[PDB]
RNA sequence: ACGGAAACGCUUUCUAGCUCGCUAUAAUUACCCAU
């Protein structure tokens, strides 16, 4: 759960739960979580984030059941992202995701993610 | 009863949909990094007056001003008496009044392939030496979005024969507009603006436009 | 002590309508703590021994400090960073933790431990409790950007 | 005097472009790297913005002596022509690149032709352990021709030079020919021809006459 | 039957449903349908899903009559693709798939299968 | 027989200039299975 009051501390203290590469000292304390990797699903995000500001909710939500294929499937494989949807409680914040402020909070609960992999990299 | 007013509807059928930017705000983090200007209620896009009337001022500025104008200003005494000018006493309240260009055809975009009035074109630059990437999401209407235009030109009692010299005028500003771009990133596409359905008519009375609608072919 | 109120006004504006708005704008800054100035508007009220030691020397001389001493940024990075100064969601601050990093990346590498100074201290006095050292950067970075503008 | 130039050449493909675009919600198992289409026809468009990118890129290192380090620092024969923000008198400079869309549109047709775009499975194979990564990028398909519409734009400054900056146009028409027109560049991917080229006078009265036949060489 | 809001949530309660190899415990939990031989089943509906998002429905019905051809031919062999399109209601899907709408949202129904497939294996 | 009366916050102004969705990538590997 994620109200508009905790969608980015929620998002910072997940990034910090990623657990690092504690093996390979040289350069350390990198994630097993890529940054090409996680664009991936900001970018199925950050084009519902425009078109909820446009279109209604009820000629939207097709997209947004994709959503939890998108982020089932890309953690299916490659562990690293399993990682991330199972501390940065992602398939749990798609079951609340009933109007366009939920939407428009998720879309922007994924921009935190993106914003502290980036800083905290 | 030499005061009338008259209107030029048109439509602005594009092609090479266009970018009159807006809102440049800090945009979202992965999101339209310059979206356009739109209506609050509908966001659907427009085509502002103001877009369009800087826009057909600096192509006619080209062709009658006889010599460069570093102003606005400075432009020549055909220009000032249509557009308006703020250092002479004589040419204000300019003649024609530019209104904002709505979508005419939402409902004949709906029905068909396209499914948002907005497409979002993905335009990376490659750096020169070092040949990496910096890559942009400039939002821009899509295709054949068809815009209704106005043109409102007041029949002041100082007109005299002149009424007939500005439509030389307006006409070859619509004219060059349909050569040049209209907003945005012009040079890369985003203008081929189509004016058509041209016809004059008089909003307010006593005038006769019988003799005009052919110069709107 | 005492409290100033300045007002910056253009050219040929009355003086009746000029020692009026900074005549009830010196009332903000006698309100605040009467021991305060008060800046262009009825906010930037910070109190003056607050105003010179954390505003006029400590962050606009940073702030001259870097923009003089480097050469690829400019403008168009105060501005985005003073828009996020005015609004300041919970949101902006992840938002802002962004843009300051992916600007280390662009820069040349033989400024960037200099850019990386910057934007750990800049960073630093945005995300705060007190409120207190983010206004005084909304206010440095208006003056670092009034006394450049180019005709 | 004030002209405008318009170049009617047409694009046809050889091997199969990709100016991409990135389809956001893709699927599994289906083309993960889309090109632009148009956003009614689906049809695959060329961008002004890819071509401008590749003329001038192009043209850098053959017009351009003391190499550019920035688009900023083009040597002022190129800046001309593609325009220059870092300088007073070169912004927005004479060329207009409009969006080549498609025009056979049922040539293809009766050729045998399900869709407009192909797919192309690739596989980066992995060279230790023989590991496969497959990828399904589209392509326009081979003998699509394309609407290029270069305008070019001629004010009192010109003088001698207008026919000085025909050669860079043509040789702009001839150093992509040699390159791909964007792509998945290296293997194949738009080794494209620029077939029939035709330079009009859309505005202004100016004979071009001597200005086609240096167009056929 | 599936909607614009279920077509997920019935792909992940089909795949739990799909019984596992409760023989031969070690590396227990695989499931009898093997994953090369169900990108069969979506490379059938994701070559539709893309060109129903160019085509029109009705110069693009006869491909999708042959996917009741194919999801019943590669489960009249191989029975554990039968295990599949009985619990996953596939051949009832494709019974109401008038429409490009119904089309891409099979098409997409799919790739949630084939999505918790991968993640719950 | 109102510190009143008459008075358009208004005229002029293109969100514009520059910018390649690009970079690397053999649809391939393995050799059996059923009775």
Redesign the pocket.
């Known amino acids: 759960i994620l109200t508009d009051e905790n969608y980015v501390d929620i998002a910072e203290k997940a990034i910090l739960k990623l657990e690092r590469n504690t093996r390979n000292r040289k350069n350390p304390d990198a994630f097993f979580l890529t940054t090409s990797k996680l664009r991936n699903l900001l970018s199925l995000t950050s084009t519902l984030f425009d078109e909820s500001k446009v279109k209604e909710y009820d000629a939207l939500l097709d997209r947004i059941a994709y959503l939890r294929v998108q982020f089932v499937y890309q953690a299916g494989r490659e562990i690293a992202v399993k990682d991330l949807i199972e501390k940065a409680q992602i398939l749990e914040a798609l079951k609340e995701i009933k109007d366009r402020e939920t939407l428009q909070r998720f879309c922007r609960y994924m921009e935190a993610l993106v914003a502290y992999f980036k800083f905290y990299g | 009863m030499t005061f009338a007013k008259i209107k030029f509807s048109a439509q602005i059928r594009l092609e090479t949909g266009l ?4 809102s ?1 705000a800090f945009a979202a983090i992965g999101a339209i990094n310059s979206p356009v200007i739109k209506d609050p209620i509908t966001n659907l896009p427009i085509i ?1 007056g ?2 369009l ?3 057909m ?2 192509l006619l500025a080209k062709v009658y001003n006889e010599k460069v104008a570093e102003k ?2 400075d432009d020549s005494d055909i220009l000032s008496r249509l ?4 250092k002479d006493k004589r040419f ?3 003649r024609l009044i530019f209104r904002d260009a709505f979508l005419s055809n939402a409902d004949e975009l709906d029905s068909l392939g396209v499914r948002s009035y907005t497409e979002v074109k ?5 750096d020169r030496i070092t ?1 990496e ?4 999401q400039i939002e821009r209407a899509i295709r054949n979005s068809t815009f209704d235009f106005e043109l409102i030109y007041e029949i002041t009692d100082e007109n005299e024969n002149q009424v007939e010299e500005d439509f030389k005028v307006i006409r070859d500003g619509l004219k060059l507009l349909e050569l040049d ?1 209209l ?6 596409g985003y203008g081929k603006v189509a004016f058509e359905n041209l016809k004059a008519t008089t909003v307010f009375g006593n005038y006769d436009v019988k003799t005009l609608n052919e110069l709107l072919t | 002590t005492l409290s100033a109120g300045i007002g910056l006004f253009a050219d040929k504006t009355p003086i009746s309508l000029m020692a009026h708005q900074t005549g009830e704008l010196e009332e903000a800054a006698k309100g605040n703590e009467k021991d305060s100035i008060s800046l262009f508007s009825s906010d930037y009220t910070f109190k003056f021994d607050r105003f010179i030691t954390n505003v006029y020397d400590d962050k606009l001389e940073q702030i001259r400090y870097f923009f003089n001493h480097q050469d690829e940024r400019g403008k168009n990075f105060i501005y985005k960073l003073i828009e996020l100064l005015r609004n300041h969601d919970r949101m902006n601050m992840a938002r802002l933790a962004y843009y300051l990093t992916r600007l280390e990346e662009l820069t040349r590498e033989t400024d960037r431990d200099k850019f990386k100074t910057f934007k750990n201290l800049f960073y630093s006095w945005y995300t705060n409790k007190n409120d207190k050292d983010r206004k005084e950067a909304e206010l440095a970075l208006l003056l670092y950007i009034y006394e450049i503008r180019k005709d």
């Open positions: 970018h009159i930017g807006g440049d502002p103001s877009s009337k800087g826009k001022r600096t606005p200003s557009f308006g000018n703020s204000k309240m300019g993905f335009e990376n630059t490659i040949a990437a910096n890559p942009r771009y907003g945005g990133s012009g040079s890369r």
